[PDB]
Ligand binder design. Structure first.
Ligand code: MOO
Ligand code: MOO
Ligand code: MOO
Ligand code: MOO
Ligand code: MOO
Ligand code: MOO
Ligand code: MOO
Ligand code: MOO
Lengths: 67, 67, 67, 66, 66, 67
């Protein structure tokens, strides 16, 4: 119910922990890949792991268009 | 060749022009929908129209994770 | 259950609808005013109105420090 | 500045990485604000625990949860 | 402020919508900067053509093209 | 050919690699310093190095006005 209009359901296939940030790579429907860099705290708090089923969220105003 | 790690190839199915911004809705592979709000200038300059084939770009650091 | 680490509860004191986006000002702890600019579409589906209790959400990576 | 979200608080956490850094400020009512910025900024503004600072956020970066 | 991108320029365009507004500043070397902010900010900072202002951008929002 | 309206040409004067992200400082017209924090992965694939000419890109919606 949050306004972010892009919610892409997917599966974690890559995970890399840094000191402050984290990188979560999801395999989503149709064969596309989504790359997320978020805080390492949210990554540990949400219990993300390779194979977990997750949703990638993106606010519309953060989406560019390439012709 | 730009760093934005999320490039989702798709087809414009919705277009709405505002005064300063624009909303471009793409149908992408696998049946997902992407919603873009960008400037109405880039929308007119790139020549976006319903049915055009476009790529949605999203910088990794703008992607959240929902468990 | 989203990685976005900042989630500030409040009540809607401001609502302005545009053509593509819309403005939502929430009053949070301490009378602090939070202003959110989102899609017109999102406000309508989330049924936002003056007095509604909603939560404002911000990804850490959008949060700057002013000294 | 144009960013309309400016919240005053007290540094209650600071995590320094290699490129970025986390600052956790406690603002009015016990809410905590998490900010990830550049290490460079954390060295230059003078950020440390106990310090009073303001969290700034651009409106268009704020989502709404119903 | 922590945002490390602060470019000084002169307002050469201003477009007012209902909720947001476009400001186009000309900075050093003829480059133009496009910024979409809240109408509210455009009314309060005092933005108009000819005015000198600074464009601010957070590092983590800047992409790189090779 | 991307909607991102700000594209500032420059030469790399700064490069710092982290674990998940990396920092790139470009020198543009007027000696102005632009700092970009992106994914470590992106810097490696784009082969970024001191002295490289690259273009910094920013979406309008991330650009604030300081008075
Ligand atoms: O309606 Mo949104 O929060 O700009 O995707
Ligand atoms: O040094 Mo990081 O890759 O910002 O945790
Ligand atoms: O490497 Mo990026 O520009 O943070 O997606
Ligand atoms: O009033 Mo708009 O929908 O920001 O052009
Ligand atoms: O970058 Mo976060 O971990 O979604 O606040
Ligand atoms: O008017 Mo702002 O810079 O989108 O908060
Ligand atoms: O990410 Mo910064 O250090 O607020 O420009
Ligand atoms: O919001 Mo834009 O039209 O990608 O600069």
């Amino acid at each position: 119910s949050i306004s972010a209009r892009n919610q892409l359901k997917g599966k974690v296939v890559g995970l890399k922990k840094g000191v402050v940030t984290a990188e979560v790579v999801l395999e989503i429907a149709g064969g596309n890949k989504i790359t997320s860099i978020i805080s390492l705290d949210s990554v540990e708090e949400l219990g993300v792991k390779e194979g977990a089923e997750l949703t990638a969220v993106v606010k519309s105003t953060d989406v560019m268009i390439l012709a």
